[PDB]
Amino acid sequence: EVQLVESGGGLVQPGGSLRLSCAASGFNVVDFSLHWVRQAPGKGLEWVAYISSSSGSTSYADSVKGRFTISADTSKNTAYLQMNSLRAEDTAVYYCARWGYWPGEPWWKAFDYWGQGTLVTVSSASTKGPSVFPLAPSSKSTSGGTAALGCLVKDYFPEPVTVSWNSGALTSGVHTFPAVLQSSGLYSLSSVVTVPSSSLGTQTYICNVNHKPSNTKVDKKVEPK
Amino acid sequence: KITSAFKYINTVISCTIFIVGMVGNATLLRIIYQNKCMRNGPNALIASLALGDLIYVVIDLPINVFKLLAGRWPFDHNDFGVFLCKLFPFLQKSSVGITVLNLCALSVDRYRAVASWSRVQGIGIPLVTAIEIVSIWILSFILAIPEAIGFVMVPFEYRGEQHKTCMLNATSKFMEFYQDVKDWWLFGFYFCMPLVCTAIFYTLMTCEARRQLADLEDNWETLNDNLKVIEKADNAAQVKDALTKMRAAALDAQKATPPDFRHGFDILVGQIDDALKLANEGKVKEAQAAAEQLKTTRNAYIQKYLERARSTLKQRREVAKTVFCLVVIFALCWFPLHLSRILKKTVYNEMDKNRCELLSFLLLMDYIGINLATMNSCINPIALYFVSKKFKNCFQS
Amino acid sequence: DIQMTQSPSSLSASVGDRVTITCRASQSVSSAVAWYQQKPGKAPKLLIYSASSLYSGVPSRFSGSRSGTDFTLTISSLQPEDFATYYCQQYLYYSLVTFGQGTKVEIKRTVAAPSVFIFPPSDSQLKSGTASVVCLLNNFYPREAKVQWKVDNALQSGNSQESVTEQDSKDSTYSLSSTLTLSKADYEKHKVYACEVTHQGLSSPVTKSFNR
Amino acid sequence: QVQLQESGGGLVQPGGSLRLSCAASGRTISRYAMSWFRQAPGKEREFVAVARRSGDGAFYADSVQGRFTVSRDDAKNTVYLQMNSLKPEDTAVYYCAIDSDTFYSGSYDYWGQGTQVTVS
Ligand SMILES: CCCNS(=O)(=O)Nc1ncnc(OCCOc2ncc(Br)cn2)c1-c1ccc(Br)cc1
């Protein structure tokens, strides 16, 4: 089967270095040309560079010229992309792609098989656990109707953070918003529930916060002021 | 008062049109199949036209001439004469139906002749054309049916003797009201549909043939002009832009190239790609040499392709010219009688004081208008001899 | 260099309708265009070649058309699997490749006004060193809405962060959160706080306020 | 300074069809979106329908979905609201409104006088 795989992703500091590898199975790389494509978080698709090992012809984009180098290895059937002196706007997801040669249909076949993609993020912040804070309603906040509870997590630097309500019990009417990037460089996130009764009957409402990279488990208790 | 001199004129011109229209159609039918390099699509339809006219001129003329020489139909006192009173309208209108439908089919075929001009055809009569001519023949014969029925020989008295006269007499309600709308039927079927259809299809053809040539000229000119621009360039940006335009032009020109020349266009695109790569690396002179390499391929392959294409489209048009010249001559010949009959039915007023002398004029013009229509049956060969420019050598040979 | 533009940024269409997306090229490229579909958390896969050509395995509902420098992608039946982002690409040569911005297709619903709540900062928050005031909009369609902060009847710009949520599969709705961050002096010298919300379903903007 | 006016109204038997047109002058109306509002005693200015810029679409509330239909005519700068299969609860005063944001934020500043419709 025809397959492409990518590797070499992680966390690097600004001005650092990285080396990404793209391996192909099911075909030889001397019958095709290999291209790299970049997608910024919440943006469109962008072209980066390409190489052809039949003639050893390479080209780059204007915004990444002089800092990225591309190479191929026909013995191991692989392509390599070396990145140096990265800046803030270089965090994205990277994809590998194949393109056919001219005299016939395969040129009209454009990009056929895409890679899985590798997430590359650059930052100048350390790893630390978050802080959990309550968001309680008032006695006049829709008395006799529906109230909303919340827990707010702040100042963390993993990519993912896990938030659960009552150890996975309450799920209906719960949605947590995507994390947003603060000015300093860390992240903030919120979780809110919309239970209709704020009485002391079933008002445990424990926010369980899991932060695997810092191996932090936090339990948050809410209380109606 | 009408005199017998015009009767003699009518009979002599009838005897003349017989001779003129017999041998011409016979020799056209001989040629259409005698010469090996002659048979194709439109020519078979022309032969069908000629045969349809030949049946009429070989059956109907030698009874009309006698009817004009004498004052009676053939075999009035014999039963067999009844049969020869319904063949006359049937053949005479079946011929016209065949001619009209064949002209319309020719117009449609000539429009299809340039709608996929890249596609090439074979030789001989196509598979569809034979069934097309068979359908035209059968449809004309069937559509001519409601004229033979009801045409009866009615008795009349003269000099104390009882003789016959052939005319349309009422038999049933549908043919009774048909006797009141057939005049509009003829003018709307044999004169209205063909002219409009041929005019409409002619204009579409003229539009298509025009654009194509414009596109070909645009592609060739942009190729030549961008090559000229690259010839004396100074920087990589302009070379890259001009080579991009040239690559787009080559792809668009190849897309319109029918399946020898495709190999030439592939080689052209390869050389353009080599020039683009050399320019992208960051050199100028090598790009100039690579662009200069394109001249041999341009002067070997593309010029011949352009030549042939232009010449072919010239030929395609000549055929359209012969077809539509035939259409216009048919319309010109068949207009006067229809106008005369419609005007006599509509604008003639019985209460008019001077309606007599005017009618004395009108009848006279009608007495030639009919004749004009008849002449059409023999105008097809001569018109083909002065128009086709290829039947000239056939007739001479 | 060769810029290429997509007209409709977002479409709201339901099951069983037809959609048409137009992509326009700046220069005169040939039929060398291609169409791609992307769903969240996945790599693109392609549908249409050469401005009119179907790939192997793609459903035959997708169609493409070309006219001069304008390219059209048409879908006749909208199955539930056809809710994703689409892209138009030109591939005239290796080093000249340009992508479109993108068009998002979403489900259609009935207009509903947001519900607005506010939350004052907590005691632990105000003893930590920084304070944050949050106010929340729930269960509205369509997406477009605006939130305005007011302190002491004085408008404030900056220090406000907005977060949005994708369409909930249960009801095809949204939620939005606005957080305003201040230092201790900023929260202590001012007195009145409020946030107001404006949506197409609201007759007049709705404000919710609190004091200390 | 934009002047807007809408017509139609009166007493209509149940099940009838009614058309109300809202027109205006003072701005380039073809670049905006216009909305309809319905006010009845005991109800505070409910929303009914909205028509966006040409080529975008129209949206309706749940109470009037299907029965109604909103249409745009940028040549004459008009919006049309067609209603059928009415019910006695419809009886109310209708207002036309024109928003103020090109990003469909939803700010309403110019409001019409409204027409009265009664049924049953
Ligand atoms: C009772 C007389 C027949 N009935 S009638 O009076 O109603 N009509 C006509 N009478 C006398 N001569 C007519 O045409 C003479 C020329 O015919 C002809 N045919 C084929 C070719 Br090739 C060349 N010339 C028509 C006539 C009218 C309309 C049509 Br369509 C066809 C023929």
Domain count, chain D: 1
For residues B223 and B249, what is the distance between their CA atoms, to the nearest angstrom?
A: 7
Quote the tokens at residue A155: 């100042």
CA C46 to chain centre: 23
Q: How far is CA A13 from CA A5, B105, C2, in A?
A: 25, 78, 34
Domains assigned to chain B? 4-208+371-396 (1.20.1070.10), 209-347 (1.20.120.10)
Looking only at the bridges linking them, the beta strands covering A131-135 and A149-156 are antiparallel
DSSP classification of residue B82:
G
- Residue B220 corresponds to which amino acid? W
CA A24 to chain centre: 24
Q: Are A88 and A14 in contact (CB under 8 A)?
A: yes
What method was applied to determine this entry?
A: cryo-EM
Nearest to C111 among D50, D107, D108 (CB): D50
Q: Do the Cβ atoms of B248 and C95 come within 8 Å? A: no
- Residue A16 corresponds to which amino acid? G
Q: Ligand 1 centroid to D67 CA: how many Å? A: 64
Question: Which residues of chain B are within 8 Å of residue C96 when distances are taken between CB atoms?
Answer: 244
Domains assigned to chain C? 4-106 (2.60.40.10), 115-210 (2.60.40.10)
Cβ–Cβ contact D103 with C under 8 A: yes
Q: Are B351 and B358 in contact (CB under 8 A)?
A: no
Query: Other CB atoms closer than 10 Å to residue B6's CB: what's the count?
Result: 12
Q: Are A225 and A138 in contact (CB under 8 A)?
A: yes
Resolution limit, Å: 3.3
Q: How far is CA A21 from CA A25, A81, A192, B338, C25, in A?
A: 13, 7, 42, 86, 34
CATH code of the domain containing D75: 2.60.40.10
**Optimal mutation site among B251, B263, B267, B277, interface A, most CBs of chain A within 10 A:** B277
Sheet with A216-220: strands ordered across: A162-165, A207-211, A216-220
The string of DSSP letters for B146-188 reads HHHTTEEEEEEEETTEEEEEEEE---SHHHHHHTTTHHHHHHI
**Considering only alpha carbons, which residue of chain C is nearest residue B272?**
C93
Q: Are A157 and A126 in contact (CB under 8 A)?
A: yes
Give the residue whose CA is nearest to atom 2 of ligand 1: B89
Q: How far is CA D98 from CA A48, D64, D112, in A?
A: 46, 20, 9
* Residue that the structure tokens 């009141």 belong to: B180
For residues B333 and A77, what is the distance between their CA atoms, to the nearest angstrom?
A: 80
Q: Which residues pair with C123 in a beta bridge?
A: none
For residues B155 and B76, what is the distance between their CA atoms, to the nearest angstrom?
A: 10
Q: Do the Cβ atoms of C144 and D103 come within 8 Å? A: yes
Quote the tokens at residue C22: 């137009």
Q: Do the Cβ atoms of B255 and C93 come within 8 Å? A: no
List b or e across B23-45, with b for residues whose CB sees 16 or more CB atoms inside 10 angstroms: ebbeebbebbeeeeeeebbbbbb
* Residue that the structure tokens 């494509």 belong to: A37
**Considering only alpha carbons, which residue of chain C is nearest residue D109?**
C204
Q: Is B128 exposed, middle or buried (0-12, 13-18, 19+ CB in 10 A)?
A: exposed
Domains assigned to chain A? 3-122 (2.60.40.10), 131-220 (2.60.40.10)
Looking only at the bridges linking them, the beta strands covering C174-182 and A92-99 are unpaired
Those residues with Cβ within 8 angstroms of residue C25's Cβ, 6 or more apart along the chain or in another chain = C2, C4, C33, C69, C70, C71, C90
B190 lines ligand 1 (CB under 6 A): yes
The string of DSSP letters for chain D reads --EEEE---EEE-TT--EEEEEEEESS-GGGS-EEEEEE-TTS--EEEEEE-STTT-EEE-SSSTTT-EEEEETTTTEEEEEE-S--GGG-EEEEEEEE--TT----EEEE---EEEEE-
Quote the tokens at residue B376: 């059409």
For residues B379 and B162, what is the distance between their CA atoms, to the nearest angstrom?
A: 41
Give the residue whose CA is nearest to atom 8 of ligand 1: B89
Between B and C, how many residue pairs show a Cβ–Cβ distance under 8 A?
Answer: 20
Cβ–Cβ contact C14 with D under 8 A: no
Nearest to A103 among B266, B277, B280 (CB): B266
Give the residue whose CA is nearest to atom 18 of ligand 1: B374
Q: Using beta carbons and an 8 Å cutoff, which residues of A are at the interface with B?
A: 57, 59, 102-103
Q: Do the Cβ atoms of C200 and D107 come within 8 Å? A: no
Q: Please give the residue range of the domain that contains residue D76.
A: 4-119
Q: Are B67 and B84 in contact (CB under 8 A)?
A: no
DSSP classification of residue B299:
I
The ligand 1 atom at the shortest distance from the C-alpha of residue B337 is 27
Quote the tokens at residue B177: 């009201």
**Optimal mutation site among A57, A107, A133, A198, interface C, most CBs of chain C within 10 A:** A133
Cβ–Cβ contact A33 with C under 8 A: yes
Q: Which of C115, C108, C88, C119 is nearest to C25 (CA)?
A: C88
Q: Are C72 and C7 in contact (CB under 8 A)?
A: no
C neighbours by CB contacts (3+ pairs under 8 Å): A, B, D
Helix, strand, or coil (residue A205):
coil
Q: Which residues pair with B154 in a beta bridge?
A: B165
Q: What is the dihedral of CA B360, B362, B363, B365, to 10 degrees?
A: 120
Phi first, then psi: what are they for D71, rounded to 5°?
A: -135, 155
Q: Do the Cβ atoms of B244 and C92 come within 8 Å? A: yes
Q: Are A39 and A95 in contact (CB under 8 A)?
A: yes
